[PDB]
Amino acid sequence: MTAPTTIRALTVAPLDIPLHVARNLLVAVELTDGTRGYGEAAPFPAFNGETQDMAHAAILAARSLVEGADVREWRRIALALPALPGMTGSARCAIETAILDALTRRARLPLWAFFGGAATSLETDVTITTGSVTAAARAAQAIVARGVTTIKIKIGAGTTIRTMEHDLARIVAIRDVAPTARLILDGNCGYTAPDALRLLDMLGVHGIVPALFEQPVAKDDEEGLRRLTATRRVPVAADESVASATDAARLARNAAVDVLNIKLMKCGIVEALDIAAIARTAGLHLMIGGMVESLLAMTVSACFAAGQGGFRFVDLDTPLFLAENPFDGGMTYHGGTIDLTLIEAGHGVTPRSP
Amino acid sequence: TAPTTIRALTVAPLDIPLHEVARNLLVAVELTDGTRGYGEAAPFPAFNGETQDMAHAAILAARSLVEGADVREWRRIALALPALPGMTGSARCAIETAILDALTRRARLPLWAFFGGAATSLETDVTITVTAAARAAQAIVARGVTTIKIKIGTIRTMEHDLARIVAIRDVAPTARLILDGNCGYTAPDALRLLDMLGVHGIVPALFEQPVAKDDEEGLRRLTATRRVPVAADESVASATDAARLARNAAVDVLNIKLMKCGIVEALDIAAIARTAGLHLMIGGMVESLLAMTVSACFAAGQGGFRFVDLDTPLFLAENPFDGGMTYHGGTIDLTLIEAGHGVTPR
Structure with missing residues (x-):
């Protein structure tokens, strides 16, 4: 028997938002019962070196421990992420956000x-x-x-x-x-x-x-x-x-x-x-x-x-x-x-959707 | 009145016979929508000189703040008890518990x-x-x-x-x-x-x-x-x-x-x-x-x-x-x- 809170899918797509472009990721988790949580990776290479591809890589790397997990256990998952070799700050964030959003979306x-x-x-x-x-x-x-x-x-900047x-x-x-x-x-x-x-x-x-x-x-x-x-x-x-x-x-x-x-x-x-x-x-x-x-x-x-x-x-x-x-x-x-x-x-x- | 509003803060004796006796308090919040949450105050006089009755007063005195508040705001309520007049540690625990139990009972x-x-x-x-x-x-x-x-x-x-x-x-x-x-x-x-x-x-x-x-x-x-x-x-x-x-x-x-x-x-x-x-x-x-x-x-x-x-x-x-x-x-x-x-x- 399949528990409704079990995470069935961890997916990710680009989220490039024009300025006036920001290379972001949109992460989505879905529970076996249908509920979806979202989260967003906004890596800023200039800030710490991490990039969209690097954070994209991390999220895929994390399917191993996120999929099959229970959304009710958001804390043991969060604590498990850092140990993955490719793991990055902004994926930790987007993953954790997506998990808490599912947990609480469902709980109203x-x-x-x-x-x-x-x-x-x-x-x-x-x-x-900083301009004129x-x-x-x-x-x-x-x-x-x-x-x-x-x-x-x-x-x-760095005078x-x-x-x-x-x-x-x-x-x-x-x-x-x-x-x-x-x-x-x-x-x-x-x-x-x-x-x-x-x-x-x-x-x-x-x-x-x-x-x-x-x-x-x-x-x-x-x-x-x-x-x-x-x-x-x-x-x-x-x-x-x-x-x-x-x-x-x-x-x-x-x-x-x-x-x-x-x-x-x-x-x-x-x-x-x-x-x-x-x-x-x-x-x-x-x-x-x-x-x-x-x-x-x-x-x-x-x-x-x-x-x-x-x-x-x-x-x-x-x-x-x-x-x-x-x-x-x-x-x-x-x-x-x-x-x-x-x-x-x-x-x-x-x-x-458009 | 939002369903998440606290209608009533309640407390009753919770005396449990030691297989002495434990003079505890059963606290209870009731939300507008009918949801009930429970908390327990177990004051130990031998420890800090806090007493069943001392904490009973604290809880009732807290009705002013707790009753009419939203259970969705467990943290601000909780951060605020300390000052209420006559506040007892064990009644802070009992209240906070009752509040969280109501918020998360309602949310399955x-x-x-x-x-x-x-x-x-x-x-x-x-x-x-x-x-x-x-x-x-x-x-x-x-x-x-x-x-x-x-x-x-x-x-x-x-x-x-x-x-x-x-x-x-x-x-x-x-x-x-x-x-x-x-x-x-x-x-x-x-x-x-x-x-x-x-x-x-x-x-x-x-x-x-x-x-x-x-x-x-x-x-x-x-x-x-x-x-x-x-x-x-x-x-x-x-x-x-x-x-x-x-x-x-x-x-x-x-x-x-x-x-x-x-x-x-x-x-x-x-x-x-x-x-x-x-x-x-x-x-x-x-x-x-x-x-x-x-x-x-x-x-x-x-x-x-x-x-x-x-x-x-x-x-x-x-x-x-x-x-x-x-x-x-x-x-x-x-x-x-x-x-x-x-x-x-x-």
């Missing part, structure tokens, strides 16, 4: 309810890419118009005093167009502890004190981080540096950062839950984010953060930049306010 | 599945409280139980307990042995007992809370000894205790009891132990089938529990309940629980 259980039900809405910020000063203000005007109050500002004075020029113009906006700085591993600091003074001169400097120094520079953090003048967030419950434990231990940025696409859900717990207990604050993701990975991210509650920073903006939306359902935007109340089973997102 | 979702479904059975030990020692060891193995928890606690007085565990070893020479120090030794004293234990060639599986709740430097030096594995019991109560304990490498094993701080708090503890590589034991107070089943659903669900101390429904003269976990000697099966923890009043 909002995914945000699964994650705790602390909240059912979020207030997202919106990112401004004109574009920064132009962007900032569109933001303000939307009703978004926090804005994340990209800067650097001078002129590159900094240009990055500084942008931030000024942006504050001018948004005088009461909460500002986040996204260093993106492009600063030295000193360089990072020099700039904070230029910004201090013009009367700007960022609400957060996210990942000023480089990934392996948990010393610059620790450093910058000690000069208690701007909250420092670990992004690239934190990608496991273990990094998170260490970061907290060495007082390297004030804020942890969680991304399900980096490590998956089961792991994120542990990072969440470690941050809570160490009293580090939480940012939620993502790669280049559609409504699917981004909804799951909001159901995670709202469900859990306790996230000071929410950076779930990418579906505002995509030029297509291949999905039915999922979270809803009202200005900068993400609404989850219409999600009644799983994460509510399903593929459409 | 076994609790162990909600907790991850890592496993679906566990293997429990049984406790022994000097002739009286071997008398217990004998019936235990005649139950098929392979782990034995020996409660214990002058060089003389160690001698006596040594004669005990040696009497139990001679009777069941292959069974895994836990020592339940119970904040009853100083470090030098404990080691002294280990020494006089490794003479008869006895090394216990675990030494549970050898020192006082406050001597986390005692636990610590015992643990650097790297001889026997040391578990924190009374010393670990919150996610914060757990994180400190782990930072200072004070112990090897953390003993979770849901009845102490509730389920949400317990999840964070498990998580902190896991990332630090500490091992876990799951226990309880004097709980009935209900709290003991949630406890199993928690451990089996999260998986990764080396020690399972869930025996109290055995020392019990009556069972007011239907369903839940089943015993087969020392093995607990959750396999037959289809919705919530599957426990209900008789």
Whole structure:
């Protein structure tokens, strides 16, 4: 006799979404009883080296342990994935999402309810890419118009005093167009502890004190981080540096950062839950984010953060930049306010057809 | 009014005759749509001076917050109890349990599945409280139980307990042995007992809370000894205790009891132990089938529990309940629980 919760099929297709392309995967699990969960891989090679083919390979590699398994055992499966030779972060994520979506779709259980039900809405910020000063203000005007109050500002790359004075020029113009906006700085591993600091003074001169400097120094520079953090003048967030419950434990231990940025696409859900717990207990604050993701990975991210509650920073903006939306359902935007109340089973997102 | 809304928070005496008597409380939430969930508060006055009545008030006082809330928001409710006026740890557990049991009963979702479904059975030990020692060891193995928890606690007085565990070893020479120090030794004293234990060639599986709740430097030096594995019991109560304990490498094993701080708090503890590589034991107070089943659903669900101390429904003269976990000697099966923890009043 066949148990309804048994996983019959793990399938995957490309999910290339045009911008203005994002090479993503759409993962699907089906239970012997007919229910389907979906999940999405959004590998970002520039971020960690992993690619679509590599994450595509991993998902196929995982059929061995996923198919035949019970969806009710999402935790022993999640823990089994890493051991597969080809395994990658964003497949862990897409697989785990697809499994939890099936489990909860079937149970008629909002995914945000699964994650705790602390909240059912979020207030997202919106990112401004690094370009000209004109574009920064132009962007900032569109933001303000939307009703978004926090804005994340990209800067650097991996430096001078002129590159900094240009990055500084942008931030000024942006504050001018948004005088009461909460500002986040996204260093993106492009600063030295000193360089990072020099700039904070230029910004201090013009009367700007960022609400957060996210990942000023480089990934392996948990010393610059620790450093910058000690000069208690701007909250420092670990992004690239934190990608496991273990990094998170260490970061907290060495007082390297004030804020942890969680991304399900980096490590998956089961792991994120542990990072969440470690941050809570160490009293580090939480940012939620993502790669280049559609409504699917981004909804799951909001159901995670709202469900859990306790996230000071929410950076779930990418579906505002995509030029297509291949999905039915999922979270809803009202200005900068993400609404989850219409999600009644799983994460509510399903593929459409033309 | 959404079907998921809590219509009524309820509590009733749950007095179960000790095969003394356990003065517990049966908590119950009822949802608009008719769904009922259950929780159990088993306060232990001898432990933290919390009482059946003290916790009864806590639960009723919680009606203001709980009644009218949505069971879909188990986590925010749960994070909020602590402040309610007169809140008792065991009523936090009983409430949270009742709430989760309603959410997952309604969703035809076994609790162990909600907790991850890592496993679906566990293997429990049984406790022994000097002739009286071997008398217990004998019936235990005649139950098929392979782990034995020996409660214990002058060089003389160690001698006596040594004669005990040696009497139990001679009777069941292959069974895994836990020592339940119970904040009853100083470090030098404990080691002294280990020494006089490794003479008869006895090394216990675990030494549970050898020192006082406050001597986390005692636990610590015992643990650097790297001889026997040391578990924190009374010393670990919150996610914060757990994180400190782990930072200072004070112990090897953390003993979770849901009845102490509730389920949400317990999840964070498990998580902190896991990332630090500490091992876990799951226990309880004097709980009935209900709290003991949630406890199993928690451990089996999260998986990764080396020690399972869930025996109290055995020392019990009556069972007011239907369903839940089943015993087969020392093995607990959750396999037959289809919705919530599957426990209900008789």
